[PDB]
Design a protein around this ligand. Structure first.
Ligand SMILES: [Mg+2]
Ligand SMILES: [Mg+2]
Ligand SMILES: [Mg+2]
Ligand SMILES: [Mg+2]
Ligand SMILES: [Mg+2]
Ligand SMILES: [Mg+2]
Ligand SMILES: [Mg+2]
Ligand SMILES: [Mg+2]
Ligand SMILES: [Mg+2]
Ligand SMILES: [Mg+2]
Ligand SMILES: [Mg+2]
Ligand SMILES: [Mg+2]
Ligand SMILES: [Mg+2]
Ligand SMILES: [Mg+2]
Ligand SMILES: [Mg+2]
Ligand SMILES: [Mg+2]
Ligand SMILES: [Mg+2]
Ligand SMILES: [Mg+2]
Ligand SMILES: [Mg+2]
Ligand SMILES: [Mg+2]
Ligand SMILES: [Mg+2]
Ligand SMILES: [Mg+2]
Ligand SMILES: [Mg+2]
Ligand SMILES: [Mg+2]
Ligand SMILES: [Mg+2]
Ligand SMILES: [Mg+2]
Ligand SMILES: [Mg+2]
Ligand SMILES: [Mg+2]
Ligand SMILES: [Mg+2]
Ligand SMILES: [Mg+2]
Ligand SMILES: [Mg+2]
Ligand SMILES: [Mg+2]
Ligand SMILES: [Mg+2]
Ligand SMILES: [Mg+2]
Ligand SMILES: [Mg+2]
Ligand SMILES: [Mg+2]
Ligand SMILES: [Mg+2]
Ligand SMILES: [Mg+2]
Ligand SMILES: [Mg+2]
Ligand SMILES: [Mg+2]
Ligand SMILES: [Mg+2]
Ligand SMILES: [Mg+2]
Ligand SMILES: [Mg+2]
Ligand SMILES: [Mg+2]
Ligand SMILES: [Mg+2]
Ligand SMILES: [Mg+2]
Ligand SMILES: [Mg+2]
Ligand SMILES: [Mg+2]
Ligand SMILES: [Mg+2]
Ligand SMILES: [Mg+2]
Ligand SMILES: [Mg+2]
Ligand SMILES: [Mg+2]
Ligand SMILES: [Mg+2]
Ligand SMILES: [Mg+2]
Ligand SMILES: [Mg+2]
Ligand SMILES: [Mg+2]
Lengths: 154, 75, 133
RNA sequence: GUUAUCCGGAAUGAUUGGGCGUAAAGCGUCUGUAGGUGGCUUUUUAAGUCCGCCGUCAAAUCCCAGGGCUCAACCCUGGACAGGCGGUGGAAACUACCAAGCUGGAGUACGGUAGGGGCAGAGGGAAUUUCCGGUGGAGCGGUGAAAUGCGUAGAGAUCGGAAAGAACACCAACGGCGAAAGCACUCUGCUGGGCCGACACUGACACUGAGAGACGAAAGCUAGGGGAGCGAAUGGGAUUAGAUACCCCAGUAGUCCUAGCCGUAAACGAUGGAUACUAGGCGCUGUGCGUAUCGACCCGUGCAGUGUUGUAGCUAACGCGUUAAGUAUCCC
C-alpha cells in the first residue's frame, strides 16, 4: 500500500534533478506488517524498491482474540509521538494517515490512535512500529514475572 | 570546653567574629570582599537564633540578652 | 534527598537501563516494604540487607538481560505518582490498574502498603506511591 | 447554501498535557525576609487521607429500565452512579501534629596547606616623551606610490645628565583564585573564603527565594587633583565621481588618582540553584593514605576542583554525555 509519493530534488549545475520518494507499507492483514522507503526516477520503480526494503524490515504485531491491542501504549521516533489504545469490538480503526495505514495493513481491527507531536508520514509509521513492537502479550508477562495467568487477570 | 558545637557557643563565636570584623570594615570601607563574608556569617548567626527560638524559648531569650544580640525581626 | 521513595525508584531505573543486575539502595521501612512487595510480584530476582557505620543497604539482584544485552524487547519502567508537590489519593472505585493489570500499582493505605489487587480484595483506597510496568 | 456567535480540532496558556545551549524563552551575580518543599527511628494525635451508616444537594433536564400518543420527536412512572457539603462510628500506612531519640545532610572547634581573592602602606626596573648640554652637519619621518609635518634658528643619529606620568616583558600553561564583574614587577601589614585529615562537638539547624539589599567591565557625569603615551571629536595631507571613511601628520575630551553618581554589555558555558543516581580512556591542581626509600621522585589509590575524546541514554539535527543538554524530586 503506497502511503506517500513526493518529489524530492537534488540540484546540479544543469538544473533540477528530479526524483520520487515513496513511503510504502506491506501487510498480509493477518498480523504481519512492515514499513519501507524508496527512491527512484519513476513512480513505479521507487514503489518497487520501497516494497523490497519493507519486506526485509518486517515484524509482527501482538493481537488479541478480538483483533486489537494487548494494552495502551506510547511511542517515540524523532518528533513523532504515537498513542495507541485498545478498543471494544465493532469500533473499527480510527486514526490518521500513517498510523491508520500501518495498523490497517497489520490487520488490527479495532484500535484507537492519535499521533501527537509531528505530522510527518514516515516518522509516524516508524513510531507505530516501535509502539506495536514493545507490546507485551499476557502469556509472556505471566512467564516473565513467574506468575500464573489467572492471578494477573484479577 | 563546654560544648564547642552547642547552639549558644556557636552563636557566641559568630557574634564575636562579627564585632571583630566591624573594625576592619571601618578602617577600610572599600573592601567589599570582606563585607560579603560578613553578610554571610551574620546570616548564619541569624539562622541559628531562629532555629533556637523554634526549639527552646528560654535558652533563646537568655542568649540574646546575654551576648547583647539585637532582638529578632519576628515581632 | 527531598524524596526518598522517588530516589529508590530512580536508582532502580538507572541500574536497570545500564544493564546491571546489582543495585545498592538505602533501606527504610518504606523501602524495605516496597522491595518485599516487588519480590512477591516477581519484578526483581532477590534482595538482601547489609550494614556498615550504622547505614543499611539493601542490595537488589535484577532480572537477567533479554537473550542478549543489545536486542532488548523489554525494559522495566517505574513512575512516581504522588510526590511532595502533589499528593494523589483515590477512593476504592478510582483505584488505578496498569495496562489492563499486566503491571501493578503501589498503595499506602490504613492497613499498610500493598498492591491494587489487595486493595480491591479488602475494599480500601489510599495514597498512590508509584506505578510499575 | 452564505454571513455572524461559541466550543472543538489547538498538546496553540500544557493539572491530566509543552518548553527555555543555538528555534520565542535562565534575572549580570550573590546575601537573605515572607512563601513552598524537607533525612532516619520510636510514640502520640487524628487535621488531611481511607471505610461504613445518616441528613441534604427542589421538581424539570442528562443516564438506565418500562409505559403512552399508529412511529419518532414529545409526555409519564420508577430508580441510580458520580461529585459537593454537614453529622456520627471505625482504620493509623503516608502528609500533618505531640513526645523522645539518631548521625550520613548542614554547621562549630582543632590541625594542616595552595592561591594574580579584596583593601591599605612601602619599594623597583626597562621603554617612551620633553627639557639642559657635548659631537656632528642634510635630510628625518611616513605610504600601495606620495604629500602635509619636523629640519641650517642645527633636525634625526649618538653620549651624558635631570624630570614626569602611565603600564608591568620573560615567567605565562589547552595553569591559580574569585559569587560575578575581575584579579599578575616586588614586599609587608588588615582581612574574606575554599579544600583536605581526624569523631572533638551540636543534632535537621536544610534547599530555594516573590518583594528588599549589596556588589556590578567599558563608556558617561558631578567636584578636586594629574596629564608621558594613546586617542573619540576637530584640523591639515592624500585616495576617490564624491570620501563628512579606510591610510598619514598633528591633536582636545577622556584614559590615571581621590570622593561620589550611573546599573547597562555577546555581564556567554549564549546552559538558574540544591540533591540523589548512572562505562570508561587520557590529562592537570591542591591535598591524604599505603608503597619507594626512611627524602625527591616513584607507583597504586581516597576525596575536592579543573580539561580533552567517548559507552548507555537524550536530542529536530548539530551535539551533550559524572562539570549532562541523561534518569528522577523541590524551589525561582
Ligand atoms: Mg544508492
Ligand atoms: Mg520530545
Ligand atoms: Mg494533531
Ligand atoms: Mg474526596
Ligand atoms: Mg442552515
Ligand atoms: Mg485547549
Ligand atoms: Mg498562543
Ligand atoms: Mg513549544
Ligand atoms: Mg538568533
Ligand atoms: Mg534565543
Ligand atoms: Mg546565567
Ligand atoms: Mg541572557
Ligand atoms: Mg536586574
Ligand atoms: Mg540564598
Ligand atoms: Mg525561612
Ligand atoms: Mg513542615
Ligand atoms: Mg519523612
Ligand atoms: Mg433534580
Ligand atoms: Mg427509553
Ligand atoms: Mg411506543
Ligand atoms: Mg424523572
Ligand atoms: Mg453523595
Ligand atoms: Mg463525611
Ligand atoms: Mg504513625
Ligand atoms: Mg524532634
Ligand atoms: Mg593599593
Ligand atoms: Mg632608570
Ligand atoms: Mg661643528
Ligand atoms: Mg616645512
Ligand atoms: Mg628657538
Ligand atoms: Mg655647532
Ligand atoms: Mg635628538
Ligand atoms: Mg619617577
Ligand atoms: Mg573556580
Ligand atoms: Mg590586568
Ligand atoms: Mg588567607
Ligand atoms: Mg543528643
Ligand atoms: Mg528578585
Ligand atoms: Mg553601586
Ligand atoms: Mg570609566
Ligand atoms: Mg559630554
Ligand atoms: Mg575632571
Ligand atoms: Mg597631551
Ligand atoms: Mg598620535
Ligand atoms: Mg579631514
Ligand atoms: Mg587650534
Ligand atoms: Mg578632500
Ligand atoms: Mg602626539
Ligand atoms: Mg569611582
Ligand atoms: Mg540585559
Ligand atoms: Mg566578560
Ligand atoms: Mg611521573
Ligand atoms: Mg570531581
Ligand atoms: Mg566540551
Ligand atoms: Mg563529550
Ligand atoms: Mg534541550
Amino acid at each position: 500500500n503506497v502511503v506517500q509519493v513526493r518529489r524530492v530534488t537534488k540540484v546540479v549545475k544543469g538544473g533540477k534533478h528530479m526524483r520520487f520518494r515513496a513511503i510504502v507499507v506491506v501487510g498480509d492483514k493477518k498480523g504481519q506488517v512492515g514499513v519501507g522507503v524508496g527512491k527512484a526516477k519513476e513512480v513505479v520503480s521507487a514503489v518497487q524498491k520501497a516494497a523490497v526494503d519493507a519486506r526485509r524490515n518486517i515484524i509482527t504485531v501482538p493481537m488479541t482474540k478480538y483483533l486489537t491491542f494487548p494494552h495502551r501504549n506510547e511511542a517515540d521516533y524523532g518528533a513523532a509521538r504515537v498513542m495507541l489504545r485498545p478498543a471494544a469490538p465493532g469500533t473499527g480503526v480510527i486514526a490518521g494517515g500513517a498510523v491508520r495505514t500501518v495498523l490497517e495493513m497489520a490487520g488490527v481491527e479495532n484500535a484507537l490512535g492519535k499521533q501527537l507531536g509531528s505530522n510527518n508520514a514516515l516518522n509516524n509509521a516508524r513510531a507505530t512500529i516501535v509502539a506495536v513492537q514493545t507490546m507485551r502479550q499476557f502469556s509472556d508477562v505471566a512467564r516473565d514475572r513467574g506468575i500464573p495467568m489467572e492471578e494477573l487477570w484479577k | 570546653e563546654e560544648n564547642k558545637g552547642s547552639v549558644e557557643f556557636q552563636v557566641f563565636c559568630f557574634t564575636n567574629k562579627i564585632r571583630r570584623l566591624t573594625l576592619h570594615l571601618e578602617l577600610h570601607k572599600k573592601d567589599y570582599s570582606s563585607q560579603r563574608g560578613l553578610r554571610k556569617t551574620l546570616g548564619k548567626r541569624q539562622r541559628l537564633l531562629a532555629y533556637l527560638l523554634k526549639i527552646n524559648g528560654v535558652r533563646y531569650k537568655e542568649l540574646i540578652s546575654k551576648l547583647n544580640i539585637r532582638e529578632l525581626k519576628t515581632r | 534527598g527531598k524524596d526518598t521513595i522517588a530516589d529508590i525508584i530512580t536508582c532502580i531505573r538507572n541500574a536497570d537501563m545500564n544493564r546491571k543486575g546489582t543495585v545498592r539502595i538505602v533501606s527504610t521501612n518504606i523501602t524495605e516494604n516496597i522491595v518485599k512487595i516487588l519480590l512477591r510480584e516477581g519484578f526483581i530476582e532477590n534482595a538482601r540487607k547489609h550494614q556498615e557505620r550504622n547505614k543499611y543497604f539493601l542490595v537488589l539482584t535484577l532480572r537477567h538481560r533479554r537473550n542478549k544485552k543489545g536486542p532488548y524487547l523489554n525494559t522495566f519502567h517505574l513512575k512516581r505518582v504522588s510526590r511532595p508537590g502533589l499528593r494523589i489519593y483515590s477512593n476504592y472505585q478510582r483505584i488505578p490498574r496498569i495496562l489492563g493489570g499486566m503491571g501493578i500499582a503501589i498503595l499506602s493505605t490504613s492497613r499498610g502498603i500493598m498492591t491494587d489487587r489487595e486493595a480491591r480484595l479488602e475494599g480500601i483506597g489510599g495514597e498512590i506511591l508509584c506505578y510499575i510496568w
